[model samples]
Target: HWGYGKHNGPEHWHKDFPIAKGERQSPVDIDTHTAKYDPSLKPLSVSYDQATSLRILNNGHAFNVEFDDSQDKAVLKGGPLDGTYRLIQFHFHWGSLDGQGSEHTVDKKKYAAELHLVHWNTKYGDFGKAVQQPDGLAVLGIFLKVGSAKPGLQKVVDVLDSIKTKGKSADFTNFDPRGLLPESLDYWTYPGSLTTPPLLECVTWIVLKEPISVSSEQVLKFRKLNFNGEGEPEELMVDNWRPAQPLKNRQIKASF
Candidate 1:
């Protein structure tokens, strides 16, 4: 299986998933000075109903909160996009400790954690079809810094004890994803891939410039989640973040 192993890690993901070597890969370090200020970019519109939030699952890679996107219940519009995108799920990437965890970095500064809110274009048939085409997906990434414990994050932490094992899941609702965002809506946009395997180059990344706060204690709780399922070698699921990739010839657009 492909994972953060010594031999089968990010370096070897290309062996099985050919797209791993493809251009437009994600989790790149943001060089603000090099980014272009796009005044033409529109203000991002995000509307989500707590009721649309479904169950939370630990799928070995990370704990994801599923959202019911069967309708326009939760959608992301504007912000360097042509059509509306439906919020399907949100997950995170973190390290065992605070110094290094986040996927996307800014000016070489790595945060404690990174959260990804995944969405697919509504014009596409479905998430399955959207993921295969360029500009089919939109991922909003938020960086989390180590600070005082955020009360809003407690609800998510409280459920960690119940889903410590991989494949474990529980009913989760009435949790608005907006509460987790930073005050400023300013962001940087570019074309990238899914930070995971089968690294498809179909994602339009919307990474926030400002980082939200999370406490060291809450970060420890995230480390408590294991990588193995019900019966297997118990491995703590930590440092589940990919390193920054080469920017190549891509231009990062900023919506100031």
Candidate 2:
């Protein structure tokens, strides 16, 4: 994790936490795709109202946004992550550099990168406690592709400087990450854990098969940073992706 982001991104994260060494990092393969069972599961009816509102923050590592659906609570039904899951933390997974991205695999296809819009059930008290249960976390993975000229991504990359320059921070008001979604709510869902350290095996990973396109230029803006150790020389942190782990007999359901 050393020399990945900013002046001291990956170096900072790995140095602070020991468990990161053994983490089941994401981004296994981008071209590996197969129907584990089938992409036949029912689609989720999630309502992310752009008109309602959201709360955005640049969490040292990446940009994080939370939804304040006080105006309209998301009403959901019939899916692995059923019922109402309140929007909480909407964070990102990036490569040490811009070219690198984060994502796990289904049968075998790996995406250029991915975004996780994490929401926890208000019924579960809060996002912290929910991390302990298999069904506590509702993480929607939006696959990000390079050279696709995706418009939604500019909203994020445009703000990278505002929040991620040498411990600096900013507040992104009224930003709804749902626009970054991969169009089709039809996705690949499985009972899994958080891809970050400690590998909290309580998250329901809902990975979108169809990816949204973004330009290589946009990614260049995010990746071309001085990713040195806390004070080390700059190094390219491209490909901060983690290899895929054993499915552990977990079944992956899909909605095509």
Candidate 3:
């Protein structure tokens, strides 16, 4: 299985998943100096229904809060997208320590953590099918910096104990994810792939420029969660982020 370990990490992934070397790969370093301001990009439209939250689970890689996407309940529109994309789940990639964790970097600067809100385009039906298409996914990337506490994140932290082991899960509901977003939605847009293996080059990445705050203590709570299953030797699930890939021939557009 693919993991963030020294043996099976990002560097070794290309051997198993050749697409890792493909064009349009994700988590590229955002060099702001070269990023062009695109006036044509419209403001992103995001709407979510609090009740759509179903459950939160530790998928061995990262803990994700799954959402009910049966309808257009929580959807993202506009912002370098041709159609509406339905929210499926959201997860975070964090570090063992505060200095480095986020997958995408700004001027090569890493953040404490990063949140990815994964959505699939409605045009291709469900996530499974859409993921194979070029315009299948739209991942909203939010950078997290260590600072004052963010009350909204406490709800997710409170349940970490329940899912301390891999595959553990609990019901998570009525949570408004909007509270986790930064004050401004100004973002950099580019065509990229999934940061993980099977790393399909089908995602249109919308990375927010402003990072939200999270206390150092809160970040520690995430470290308590383990990468190993119930009986395996304990391994903390830290540094689960992939290093930034080469930009290749892509251009990043800023929506200011």
Candidate 4:
């Protein structure tokens, strides 16, 4: 609650947290008509095996999937991705203010939240030892909205009961985020950077425009998470999302 509601919601966060400016800064506007169409996007293979070693970290912002997988292998569609890459970690971005969500309007409409499926290209291999190479990784962004109740998100949130403590532990052994993908895999993609720190601009972003619906109640429940304890200052990490920035000199194309 300390950092929120100030004149500067997120746009000015980097002002205080200088490091934040480097984050990829996504969920921005992408007017389909104004976008340059690059139809070269190809599908990549994903293995949940890598997700098993993931650590669930609550960065006082959101639940982040800290991956500890090697970038030596990856397979898409039964074959390796044209580019050698490894599935890294994944996280999400959302809105605190009820109406607006992260991954803003293409023409003006907004979603409730944005889910990012992040991966790293093996060309560099080994985290912290690899170069952020373009074509080395890809991300799948899904838009969420507070609407009619949906079973998908309920499944994820319900588990909060199983993993609540800030340092909570659990084995989401059978977890599969892909289960939440929209019925239509059709997506709009572009070359973009990580929406978080280090803002590595090495991956392709495949963002879905059509948002899925979650119950209004679920949205409120999601807003309660903070970084510290009662005695400590309360920091609202709930809905930690930055406004989508301009797609300068960028071209995006849609696909399945």
Candidate 5:
């Protein structure tokens, strides 16, 4: 299985998943100087109901807060999207330290962490069907900087102890993910692939220009979780971020 370890990390992924070398790979460094401003891009519209949140789990690679995507109650539209997209789940990528964790960087600068809110195109019927199409998914990425403790992030951190081991999960509901978003909606959008293995080139990446804050201590709580499942050699889950991939021929557009 692909992992963030030295043996099976990003460097070794292309051997198993050839698409890792494909055009439009994600988490590319967003060079603000080069990104063109697009007046045609609309303001991103997001409406999420707290009740749709179901549970949170550590799936070895990362912790995912899954939502009930049965309806369009929680959806994302506008921006670079052609139609509405249903919120399915959200996850994070972080490093062992505060200086370098984010997948996408700005002018080669890394953040303490990164948050991805994953959504699937409603026109595709379901996430399974959507994954194969070019315009199948839309992932909103928000950088996490180390500073004040954000209550939205703390809510997730507070439950880290419950899921210390991989495969562990807990009841997590009534949580409004919007609380984690930054004040400004300005972003850079591009056509890219998933940052991890099976790196399918199907996501429309919308990375916010502004970042959310999280305390240093709060980030430590995330490191407490293990990458290995229970009854195995304990391996701390740290530095789960995939390094920025090649931009290739993709053009990143700014929505300001």
Candidate 6:
């Protein structure tokens, strides 16, 4: 029942999900200069097979691209990670015409949108169980700036019309997740939790420094999505992002 409306916004999450007030909550503001730079950090290793993509759906919250993670077909390793992390799903958070909706911010600056690729450590066996453990989830956060339309993302946008309503889904296969990444792998990482409920404190956040570009036209397409399911009043799915949590005593390490 939690939503982005005024009554159920991030401010009210703690009422139902007590962990929403936890110290390790996600989407923290990253101040680059103050962050610790570790040259010894290994380059991130990502291997996402296009065939792993199963379907795309508007899961009442965000549009999720579910992957067939039955095996280690697509796994992420290195870069502060202990074991193999299998890709399970990916989603996005965006704003309205005002142009600032990312969950995470850099130097207090917000971007037009943000993308999340959720993965679970194979050691935990499954995502359900992994999310309950401390070292279970690893989420890759990529910022989306408003600029040129990316050809790589066109494939994803092309399907938006089919999934304009909540609970609507369409078969989306053979889509390569790697094509959606930026050229540079430089990122800042820290310990955090899922932005949404159950708001588990198990995610290791890997936030890319260089953002991928998407045209304003392309970005606006996301606003056309409906937050409510069919026969509902059709609430626009905008500002579906949680505000950045306090940094507190958490230290973010950068891998250049």
Candidate with the greatest lDDT versus the true structure: 3
Whole-model Cα lDDT per candidate?
0.91, 0.58, 0.94, 0.59, 0.92, 0.92
| Tens-digit lDDT string for candidate 3 (102-188) | 999999999999999999999888899999998999999999999999999999999999999999999998888988989899999
Reference-based lDDT, residue 97, model 6: 58
TM-score of each: 0.98, 0.75, 0.98, 0.77, 0.98, 0.98
TM-score of 3: 0.98
Candidate 3 regions exceeding 4 Å error are none
Error of 6 at 226 (Å): 0.3
**What is the C-alpha lDDT profile of model 2 across 1-256, one tens digit per residue?**
4333355443354565553443322323323344354534566867766433344454334456556644335434345666667666666555644444756654565556667777776566766777777677777777676766777567767766654433434555666556676656666666766665555666777777777777778767656433333355544435544456555445556565
User: In model 5, which regions exceed 4 Å deviation?
Assistant: none
Model 6, 1-256: lDDT tens digits are 8999999999999999999989899889999899999888888999876338999999888999999999999998999999999999999999985468899999999999999999999998989999999989999999999888988898898899999888899999988988889999899999999999999999999999999999988888888999999889989999999998988799999996
Error of 3 at 105 (Å): 0.3
lDDT score for candidate 6 against the true structure = 0.92
Write the number of the candidate with greater lDDT, choosing between 4 and 5: 5
Q: What is the model-wide C-alpha lDDT for candidate 3?
A: 0.94
lDDT comparison, 2 vs 3, better candidate: 3
The root-mean-square deviation over C-alpha atoms between each candidate and the true structure, in angstroms, is: 1.0, 4.7, 0.8, 4.1, 0.9, 1.0
Name the lDDT value of residue 211 in candidate 5: 94
Worst 10 residues of 4 by lDDT: 72-81
Give me the overall lDDT of model 2.
Answer: 0.58
lDDT, candidate 4, residue 139? 74
Displacement of residue 238 (Cα, Å) in model 2 is 4.2
